[PDB]
Amino acid sequence: RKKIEPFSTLVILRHGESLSNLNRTYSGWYDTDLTEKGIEDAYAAGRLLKSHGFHFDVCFSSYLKRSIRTMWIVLDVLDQMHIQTISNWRLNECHFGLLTGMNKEQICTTLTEEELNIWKKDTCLQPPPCAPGQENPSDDPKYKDLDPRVIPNGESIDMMWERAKPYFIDQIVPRLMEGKKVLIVAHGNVMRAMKKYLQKMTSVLSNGSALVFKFDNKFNLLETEIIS
Template sequence: MHKLVLIRHGESTWNLENRFTGWTDVDLTPTGVSQAIAAGRLLRDEGWDFDLCFTSVLKRAIHTLWYVLDEMDRTWLPVVKDWRLNERHYGALQGLNKADMARQYGEQQVLLWRRSYDVPPPALTPDDPRGQRHDRRYAHLAPEQIPLTECLKDTVARVVPYWNEAIAPAIRSGQRVLISAHGNSIRALIKHLDGISDTDIVNLNIPNGVPLVYEFDAELRPLRRYYLGDAAAAEAAAAAVARQGRA
Protein backbone atom coordinates (compact mmCIF):
# COMPACT_ATOMS: atom_id res chain seq x y z
CA MET A 1 0.00 0.00 0.00
CA HIS A 2 1.26 3.52 -0.83
CA LYS A 3 0.78 6.56 1.40
CA LEU A 4 0.97 10.29 0.81
CA VAL A 5 0.79 13.21 3.23
CA LEU A 6 -0.49 16.61 2.14
CA ILE A 7 -0.41 19.72 4.28
CA ARG A 8 -1.85 23.16 3.67
CA HIS A 9 0.61 25.76 4.97
CA GLY A 10 0.11 27.25 8.45
CA GLU A 11 -1.85 30.47 8.88
CA SER A 12 -0.44 33.26 6.69
CA THR A 13 -0.55 37.00 7.40
CA TRP A 14 -3.28 37.39 4.78
CA ASN A 15 -5.24 34.41 6.14
CA LEU A 16 -5.21 36.29 9.45
CA GLU A 17 -6.33 39.51 7.78
CA ASN A 18 -8.89 37.52 5.75
CA ARG A 19 -7.53 38.77 2.41
CA PHE A 20 -7.59 36.89 -0.89
CA THR A 21 -3.99 35.80 -1.38
CA GLY A 22 -3.54 33.63 -4.48
CA TRP A 23 -0.03 34.09 -5.90
CA THR A 24 0.85 36.94 -3.51
CA ASP A 25 3.90 35.77 -1.57
CA VAL A 26 3.04 36.42 2.09
CA ASP A 27 4.68 35.10 5.27
CA LEU A 28 3.41 32.81 7.99
CA THR A 29 2.08 34.37 11.20
CA PRO A 30 3.44 33.17 14.58
CA THR A 31 0.30 30.98 14.77
CA GLY A 32 1.13 29.58 11.34
CA VAL A 33 4.65 28.73 12.50
CA SER A 34 3.23 26.99 15.59
CA GLN A 35 0.81 25.02 13.43
CA ALA A 36 3.65 23.83 11.20
CA ILE A 37 5.80 22.86 14.20
CA ALA A 38 2.84 20.99 15.75
CA ALA A 39 2.26 19.15 12.47
CA GLY A 40 5.92 18.11 12.33
CA ARG A 41 5.78 16.91 15.93
CA LEU A 42 2.62 14.90 15.24
CA LEU A 43 4.18 13.26 12.18
CA ARG A 44 7.35 12.46 14.12
CA ASP A 45 5.49 11.12 17.19
CA GLU A 46 3.30 8.92 15.00
CA GLY A 47 6.35 7.43 13.31
CA TRP A 48 5.96 8.97 9.84
CA ASP A 49 8.99 9.38 7.62
CA PHE A 50 9.51 10.63 4.06
CA ASP A 51 11.95 10.30 1.16
CA LEU A 52 10.90 13.23 -1.04
CA CYS A 53 9.01 16.48 -0.53
CA PHE A 54 7.19 18.77 -2.93
CA THR A 55 6.07 22.34 -2.42
CA SER A 56 5.06 25.46 -4.33
CA VAL A 57 7.28 28.46 -5.01
CA LEU A 58 5.42 30.51 -2.36
CA LYS A 59 7.09 31.03 0.99
CA ARG A 60 4.10 30.25 3.20
CA ALA A 61 4.21 26.67 1.88
CA ILE A 62 8.03 26.49 1.73
CA HIS A 63 8.45 27.74 5.30
CA THR A 64 5.74 25.38 6.54
CA LEU A 65 7.73 22.51 5.03
CA TRP A 66 10.91 23.79 6.71
CA TYR A 67 9.28 23.81 10.15
CA VAL A 68 7.69 20.39 9.64
CA LEU A 69 10.98 18.85 8.49
CA ASP A 70 12.97 20.57 11.22
CA GLU A 71 10.69 19.11 13.87
CA MET A 72 11.17 15.68 12.27
CA ASP A 73 14.97 16.17 12.03
CA ARG A 74 14.63 15.71 8.26
CA THR A 75 15.75 19.08 6.83
CA TRP A 76 18.21 17.13 4.68
CA LEU A 77 15.45 15.54 2.59
CA PRO A 78 15.23 16.50 -1.10
CA VAL A 79 12.60 19.18 -1.76
CA VAL A 80 11.21 19.91 -5.22
CA LYS A 81 9.57 23.33 -5.64
CA ASP A 82 7.24 23.87 -8.54
CA TRP A 83 4.89 26.73 -9.50
CA ARG A 84 2.24 24.19 -10.47
CA LEU A 85 1.61 23.57 -6.77
CA ASN A 86 1.01 27.30 -6.19
CA GLU A 87 -2.29 28.50 -4.81
CA ARG A 88 -5.06 29.15 -7.31
CA HIS A 89 -4.48 32.65 -8.76
CA TYR A 90 -7.15 34.92 -7.27
CA GLY A 91 -6.95 37.59 -10.01
CA ALA A 92 -8.13 41.08 -9.19
CA LEU A 93 -9.41 39.88 -5.79
CA GLN A 94 -5.82 39.47 -4.54
CA GLY A 95 -5.31 41.75 -1.56
CA LEU A 96 -9.01 42.41 -0.97
CA ASN A 97 -10.81 41.42 2.23
CA LYS A 98 -13.17 38.43 1.85
CA ALA A 99 -15.81 39.72 4.28
CA ASP A 100 -15.71 43.21 2.69
CA MET A 101 -16.29 41.62 -0.70
CA ALA A 102 -19.24 39.66 0.74
CA ARG A 103 -20.75 42.90 2.06
CA GLN A 104 -20.19 44.63 -1.28
CA TYR A 105 -21.14 41.86 -3.73
CA GLY A 106 -23.09 39.42 -1.53
CA GLU A 107 -22.08 36.14 0.08
CA GLN A 108 -23.35 34.13 -2.89
CA GLN A 109 -21.01 35.92 -5.28
CA VAL A 110 -18.06 35.42 -2.94
CA LEU A 111 -18.93 31.72 -2.61
CA LEU A 112 -18.96 31.51 -6.39
CA TRP A 113 -15.54 33.16 -6.61
CA ARG A 114 -14.06 31.06 -3.81
CA ARG A 115 -15.55 27.66 -4.40
CA SER A 116 -17.23 27.24 -7.80
CA TYR A 117 -15.40 24.92 -10.15
CA ASP A 118 -15.40 27.01 -13.29
CA VAL A 119 -16.19 30.66 -12.48
CA PRO A 120 -12.91 32.63 -12.32
CA PRO A 121 -12.62 35.82 -10.26
CA PRO A 122 -12.17 39.05 -12.28
CA ALA A 123 -8.76 39.01 -14.00
CA LEU A 124 -5.81 41.29 -13.30
CA THR A 125 -4.73 43.44 -16.21
CA PRO A 126 -1.30 42.33 -17.54
CA ASP A 127 0.36 45.50 -16.19
CA ASP A 128 -1.22 45.31 -12.70
CA PRO A 129 1.60 45.52 -10.11
CA ARG A 130 -0.10 42.66 -8.23
CA GLY A 131 0.67 40.36 -11.19
CA GLN A 132 3.66 38.02 -11.58
CA ARG A 133 4.72 38.69 -15.16
CA HIS A 134 7.95 40.39 -13.99
CA ASP A 135 8.68 38.01 -11.14
CA ARG A 136 11.97 36.19 -11.79
CA ARG A 137 10.71 32.90 -10.37
CA TYR A 138 8.30 32.61 -13.32
CA ALA A 139 10.76 33.83 -15.98
CA HIS A 140 10.98 30.35 -17.54
CA LEU A 141 7.26 30.43 -18.36
CA ALA A 142 5.65 31.95 -21.43
CA PRO A 143 3.68 35.07 -20.43
CA GLU A 144 0.39 33.34 -21.25
CA GLN A 145 1.26 30.53 -18.81
CA ILE A 146 1.37 33.04 -15.95
CA PRO A 147 -2.27 33.42 -14.94
CA LEU A 148 -4.12 36.70 -14.51
CA THR A 149 -6.88 34.79 -12.71
CA GLU A 150 -7.85 31.15 -12.24
CA CYS A 151 -10.92 29.14 -11.36
CA LEU A 152 -10.42 25.75 -9.73
CA LYS A 153 -10.72 24.10 -13.14
CA ASP A 154 -7.67 26.08 -14.31
CA THR A 155 -5.79 25.03 -11.19
CA VAL A 156 -6.70 21.37 -11.81
CA ALA A 157 -5.33 21.80 -15.35
CA ARG A 158 -1.82 22.51 -14.01
CA VAL A 159 -1.81 20.50 -10.75
CA VAL A 160 -2.96 17.21 -12.28
CA PRO A 161 -0.32 17.06 -15.06
CA TYR A 162 2.31 17.79 -12.40
CA TRP A 163 0.88 15.00 -10.25
CA ASN A 164 1.04 12.61 -13.22
CA GLU A 165 4.53 13.66 -14.34
CA ALA A 166 6.39 14.12 -11.08
CA ILE A 167 4.55 13.09 -7.93
CA ALA A 168 2.66 9.90 -8.84
CA PRO A 169 5.76 8.22 -10.40
CA ALA A 170 7.74 8.96 -7.23
CA ILE A 171 5.04 7.38 -5.06
CA ARG A 172 4.71 4.40 -7.40
CA SER A 173 8.47 3.82 -7.19
CA GLY A 174 8.09 3.41 -3.43
CA GLN A 175 9.16 6.87 -2.24
CA ARG A 176 7.31 8.28 0.76
CA VAL A 177 6.10 11.71 -0.32
CA LEU A 178 5.12 14.82 1.63
CA ILE A 179 3.49 17.79 -0.17
CA SER A 180 3.19 21.26 1.39
CA ALA A 181 0.77 23.38 -0.63
CA HIS A 182 -2.34 25.55 -0.48
CA GLY A 183 -6.08 25.40 0.13
CA ASN A 184 -7.05 25.33 -3.54
CA SER A 185 -4.08 23.50 -5.04
CA ILE A 186 -4.87 20.74 -2.51
CA ARG A 187 -8.59 20.91 -3.38
CA ALA A 188 -7.64 20.54 -7.05
CA LEU A 189 -5.63 17.41 -6.29
CA ILE A 190 -8.32 15.90 -4.04
CA LYS A 191 -10.95 16.55 -6.72
CA HIS A 192 -8.86 14.56 -9.17
CA LEU A 193 -7.84 11.74 -6.82
CA ASP A 194 -11.28 11.17 -5.32
CA GLY A 195 -13.27 11.95 -8.46
CA ILE A 196 -15.33 14.61 -6.66
CA SER A 197 -18.01 16.19 -8.85
CA ASP A 198 -17.92 19.84 -9.92
CA THR A 199 -20.85 20.56 -7.59
CA ASP A 200 -19.65 18.63 -4.53
CA ILE A 201 -16.19 20.21 -4.60
CA VAL A 202 -17.86 23.47 -3.45
CA ASN A 203 -18.20 21.98 0.03
CA LEU A 204 -14.57 20.97 0.49
CA ASN A 205 -12.44 23.27 2.68
CA ILE A 206 -8.90 22.59 3.84
CA PRO A 207 -7.67 23.73 7.29
CA ASN A 208 -4.21 25.25 7.82
CA GLY A 209 -1.37 23.10 9.07
CA VAL A 210 -3.11 19.73 9.53
CA PRO A 211 -1.48 16.68 7.88
CA LEU A 212 -3.89 14.95 5.51
CA VAL A 213 -3.11 11.31 4.75
CA TYR A 214 -3.97 9.36 1.61
CA GLU A 215 -3.71 5.60 1.44
CA PHE A 216 -3.58 4.13 -2.07
CA ASP A 217 -3.66 0.65 -3.55
CA ALA A 218 -0.84 -0.54 -5.83
CA GLU A 219 -2.49 1.23 -8.81
CA LEU A 220 -2.58 4.47 -6.83
CA ARG A 221 -6.33 4.34 -6.42
CA PRO A 222 -7.30 6.07 -3.15
CA LEU A 223 -8.48 3.72 -0.40
CA ARG A 224 -8.80 6.22 2.43
CA ARG A 225 -8.25 9.94 3.20
CA TYR A 226 -8.07 11.25 6.77
CA TYR A 227 -6.61 14.04 8.91
CA LEU A 228 -3.94 13.12 11.43
CA GLY A 229 -4.54 14.09 15.05
CA ASP A 230 -7.82 15.50 16.32
CA ALA A 231 -10.31 14.86 13.48
CA ALA A 232 -13.05 16.95 15.10
CA ALA A 233 -10.66 19.92 15.45
CA ALA A 234 -9.69 19.55 11.78
CA GLU A 235 -13.36 19.55 10.74
CA ALA A 236 -14.02 22.64 12.90
CA ALA A 237 -11.02 24.41 11.33
CA ALA A 238 -12.29 23.51 7.83
CA ALA A 239 -15.74 24.92 8.72
CA ALA A 240 -14.05 28.14 9.90
CA VAL A 241 -12.34 28.40 6.49
CA ALA A 242 -15.76 28.13 4.81
CA ARG A 243 -17.06 31.01 7.00
CA GLN A 244 -14.28 33.38 5.87
CA GLY A 245 -16.49 34.39 2.96
CA ARG A 246 -19.35 35.60 5.15
CA ALA A 247 -20.28 39.25 5.48
Protein backbone atom coordinates in the same frame (compact mmCIF):
# COMPACT_ATOMS: atom_id res chain seq x y z
CA ARG B 1 0.90 -4.34 17.81
CA LYS B 2 2.16 -3.46 14.32
CA LYS B 3 0.21 -2.69 11.15
CA ILE B 4 0.92 -3.77 7.58
CA GLU B 5 2.31 -0.85 5.57
CA PRO B 6 1.06 0.32 2.17
CA PHE B 7 3.16 0.07 -0.96
CA SER B 8 3.29 3.87 -1.18
CA THR B 9 2.01 6.81 0.86
CA LEU B 10 1.08 10.42 0.03
CA VAL B 11 0.75 12.88 2.94
CA ILE B 12 -0.77 16.29 2.21
CA LEU B 13 -0.40 19.03 4.78
CA ARG B 14 -1.77 22.60 4.64
CA HIS B 15 0.48 25.58 5.45
CA GLY B 16 -0.35 27.70 8.49
CA GLU B 17 -1.44 31.27 9.06
CA SER B 18 -0.04 33.86 6.67
CA LEU B 19 -0.08 37.60 7.24
CA SER B 20 -2.72 38.08 4.53
CA ASN B 21 -4.89 35.41 6.14
CA LEU B 22 -4.52 37.15 9.51
CA ASN B 23 -5.47 40.49 7.90
CA ARG B 24 -8.35 38.78 6.03
CA THR B 25 -7.27 39.86 2.55
CA TYR B 26 -7.05 37.49 -0.40
CA SER B 27 -3.49 36.55 -1.33
CA GLY B 28 -3.40 33.94 -4.09
CA TRP B 29 0.01 34.38 -5.68
CA TYR B 30 0.77 37.36 -3.44
CA ASP B 31 3.80 36.05 -1.60
CA THR B 32 2.69 36.69 1.99
CA ASP B 33 4.82 35.00 4.66
CA LEU B 34 3.98 33.09 7.81
CA THR B 35 3.06 34.95 10.95
CA GLU B 36 4.54 33.89 14.29
CA LYS B 37 1.39 31.81 14.80
CA GLY B 38 1.88 30.28 11.34
CA ILE B 39 5.42 29.29 12.28
CA GLU B 40 4.04 27.57 15.37
CA ASP B 41 1.41 25.93 13.15
CA ALA B 42 4.29 24.46 11.13
CA TYR B 43 6.04 23.15 14.25
CA ALA B 44 2.78 21.53 15.38
CA ALA B 45 2.32 19.87 11.99
CA GLY B 46 5.87 18.54 12.14
CA ARG B 47 5.23 17.07 15.58
CA LEU B 48 2.00 15.51 14.30
CA LEU B 49 3.81 13.70 11.49
CA LYS B 50 6.66 12.67 13.80
CA SER B 51 4.25 11.09 16.29
CA HIS B 52 2.91 8.92 13.45
CA GLY B 53 6.42 7.79 12.49
CA PHE B 54 6.52 9.22 8.97
CA HIS B 55 9.84 9.10 7.11
CA PHE B 56 9.59 10.73 3.69
CA ASP B 57 11.68 10.17 0.56
CA VAL B 58 10.75 13.53 -0.99
CA CYS B 59 8.77 16.68 -0.18
CA PHE B 60 6.97 19.03 -2.58
CA SER B 61 5.95 22.66 -2.13
CA SER B 62 4.58 25.47 -4.28
CA TYR B 63 6.72 28.47 -5.23
CA LEU B 64 5.08 30.53 -2.47
CA LYS B 65 7.10 31.30 0.64
CA ARG B 66 4.37 30.34 3.10
CA SER B 67 4.45 26.81 1.66
CA ILE B 68 8.25 26.59 1.39
CA ARG B 69 8.80 27.85 4.94
CA THR B 70 6.26 25.39 6.31
CA MET B 71 8.07 22.57 4.50
CA TRP B 72 11.43 23.56 5.99
CA ILE B 73 10.04 23.78 9.52
CA VAL B 74 8.24 20.45 9.19
CA LEU B 75 11.37 18.73 7.87
CA ASP B 76 13.35 20.30 10.72
CA VAL B 77 10.98 18.72 13.27
CA LEU B 78 11.10 15.36 11.46
CA ASP B 79 14.94 15.39 11.38
CA GLN B 80 14.63 15.13 7.59
CA MET B 81 16.22 18.43 6.53
CA HIS B 82 18.49 16.39 4.22
CA ILE B 83 15.78 14.85 2.02
CA GLN B 84 15.06 15.94 -1.52
CA THR B 85 12.72 18.93 -1.72
CA ILE B 86 11.06 20.15 -4.92
CA SER B 87 9.18 23.44 -5.40
CA ASN B 88 7.12 24.32 -8.46
CA TRP B 89 4.72 27.06 -9.53
CA ARG B 90 2.09 24.53 -10.64
CA LEU B 91 1.26 23.80 -6.97
CA ASN B 92 0.61 27.52 -6.36
CA GLU B 93 -2.69 28.74 -4.92
CA CYS B 94 -5.12 30.31 -7.44
CA HIS B 95 -3.92 33.56 -8.95
CA PHE B 96 -6.77 35.88 -7.92
CA GLY B 97 -6.09 38.60 -10.51
CA LEU B 98 -8.04 41.75 -9.71
CA LEU B 99 -9.19 40.26 -6.40
CA THR B 100 -5.59 40.01 -5.15
CA GLY B 101 -5.28 41.90 -1.88
CA MET B 102 -9.00 42.64 -1.47
CA ASN B 103 -10.84 42.33 1.83
CA LYS B 104 -14.39 41.13 2.43
CA GLU B 105 -15.91 44.57 1.80
CA GLN B 106 -14.18 45.03 -1.56
CA ILE B 107 -15.18 41.52 -2.67
CA CYS B 108 -18.83 42.24 -1.89
CA THR B 109 -18.57 45.51 -3.83
CA THR B 110 -16.90 43.90 -6.86
CA LEU B 111 -19.10 40.79 -7.16
CA THR B 112 -22.85 40.71 -7.59
CA GLU B 113 -24.84 38.75 -5.04
CA GLU B 114 -25.19 35.82 -7.45
CA GLU B 115 -21.48 35.91 -8.27
CA LEU B 116 -20.53 35.86 -4.59
CA ASN B 117 -22.69 32.80 -3.97
CA ILE B 118 -21.07 30.99 -6.92
CA TRP B 119 -17.67 32.18 -5.68
CA LYS B 120 -18.25 30.58 -2.26
CA LYS B 121 -20.05 27.35 -3.20
CA ASP B 122 -18.60 26.38 -6.60
CA THR B 123 -15.20 26.21 -8.30
CA CYS B 124 -15.95 27.66 -11.76
CA LEU B 125 -15.99 31.46 -11.25
CA GLN B 126 -12.91 33.12 -12.76
CA PRO B 127 -11.74 36.47 -11.38
CA PRO B 128 -10.76 39.22 -13.83
CA PRO B 129 -7.07 40.01 -14.37
CA CYS B 130 -4.95 42.47 -12.46
CA ALA B 131 -5.85 46.05 -13.31
CA PRO B 132 -3.41 48.53 -14.85
CA GLY B 133 -1.40 49.90 -11.95
CA GLN B 134 -2.12 46.90 -9.71
CA GLU B 135 1.01 45.12 -8.55
CA ASN B 136 0.80 41.65 -10.10
CA PRO B 137 2.50 38.89 -8.05
CA SER B 138 3.60 37.06 -11.22
CA ASP B 139 5.94 39.90 -12.24
CA ASP B 140 8.18 38.49 -9.49
CA PRO B 141 11.71 37.49 -10.64
CA LYS B 142 11.14 33.92 -9.41
CA TYR B 143 8.83 33.45 -12.44
CA LYS B 144 11.22 34.99 -15.01
CA ASP B 145 11.99 31.67 -16.77
CA LEU B 146 8.42 30.42 -17.23
CA ASP B 147 6.79 30.45 -20.62
CA PRO B 148 5.04 33.86 -20.46
CA ARG B 149 1.96 32.45 -22.23
CA VAL B 150 1.35 30.00 -19.37
CA ILE B 151 1.39 32.47 -16.45
CA PRO B 152 -2.18 32.85 -15.13
CA ASN B 153 -3.87 36.19 -14.50
CA GLY B 154 -7.13 35.48 -12.71
CA GLU B 155 -7.91 31.79 -12.11
CA SER B 156 -10.97 29.91 -10.99
CA ILE B 157 -10.35 26.84 -8.83
CA ASP B 158 -11.09 24.64 -11.86
CA MET B 159 -8.43 26.49 -13.90
CA MET B 160 -5.95 26.17 -11.02
CA TRP B 161 -6.51 22.42 -11.00
CA GLU B 162 -6.17 22.19 -14.78
CA ARG B 163 -2.58 23.46 -14.50
CA ALA B 164 -1.76 21.69 -11.21
CA LYS B 165 -3.07 18.30 -12.37
CA PRO B 166 -0.32 17.67 -14.99
CA TYR B 167 2.31 18.30 -12.31
CA PHE B 168 0.63 15.86 -9.91
CA ILE B 169 0.42 13.23 -12.66
CA ASP B 170 3.95 13.72 -13.99
CA GLN B 171 5.94 14.22 -10.76
CA ILE B 172 4.01 12.88 -7.77
CA VAL B 173 2.36 9.78 -9.24
CA PRO B 174 5.61 8.31 -10.66
CA ARG B 175 7.23 8.55 -7.23
CA LEU B 176 4.25 6.79 -5.64
CA MET B 177 4.56 4.05 -8.27
CA GLU B 178 8.17 3.58 -7.10
CA GLY B 179 6.98 2.77 -3.58
CA LYS B 180 8.04 6.09 -2.04
CA LYS B 181 6.52 8.12 0.77
CA VAL B 182 5.78 11.62 -0.53
CA LEU B 183 4.95 14.72 1.50
CA ILE B 184 3.24 17.75 -0.03
CA VAL B 185 2.89 21.04 1.83
CA ALA B 186 0.01 22.61 0.01
CA HIS B 187 -2.56 25.36 -0.25
CA GLY B 188 -6.11 24.53 0.77
CA ASN B 189 -7.67 24.71 -2.69
CA VAL B 190 -4.91 22.53 -4.13
CA MET B 191 -5.20 19.96 -1.33
CA ARG B 192 -8.97 19.66 -1.80
CA ALA B 193 -8.61 19.31 -5.58
CA MET B 194 -6.06 16.51 -5.14
CA LYS B 195 -8.33 14.79 -2.61
CA LYS B 196 -11.28 15.00 -5.01
CA TYR B 197 -9.14 13.67 -7.86
CA LEU B 198 -7.79 10.68 -5.93
CA GLN B 199 -11.08 9.63 -4.32
CA LYS B 200 -13.04 10.21 -7.55
CA MET B 201 -15.50 12.53 -5.84
CA THR B 202 -18.02 14.84 -7.50
CA SER B 203 -18.52 18.56 -6.91
CA VAL B 204 -13.98 21.78 5.89
CA LEU B 205 -11.08 19.96 7.57
CA SER B 206 -9.95 20.92 11.06
CA ASN B 207 -6.98 23.27 11.09
CA GLY B 208 -3.74 21.35 11.60
CA SER B 209 -5.05 18.06 10.19
CA ALA B 210 -3.28 16.04 7.51
CA LEU B 211 -4.50 13.71 4.76
CA VAL B 212 -2.84 10.30 4.37
CA PHE B 213 -3.43 8.45 1.10
CA LYS B 214 -2.27 4.82 0.98
CA PHE B 215 -1.82 3.02 -2.35
CA ASP B 216 -0.96 -0.46 -3.61
CA ASN B 217 1.52 -1.12 -6.43
CA LYS B 218 -1.10 -0.57 -9.15
CA PHE B 219 -1.99 2.86 -7.68
CA ASN B 220 -5.29 1.69 -6.23
CA LEU B 221 -6.31 3.95 -3.35
CA LEU B 222 -6.53 1.62 -0.33
CA GLU B 223 -7.37 4.21 2.32
CA THR B 224 -7.66 7.91 3.06
CA GLU B 225 -6.87 8.65 6.71
CA ILE B 226 -7.27 12.00 8.47
CA ILE B 227 -4.74 12.55 11.27
CA SER B 228 -4.89 15.39 13.77
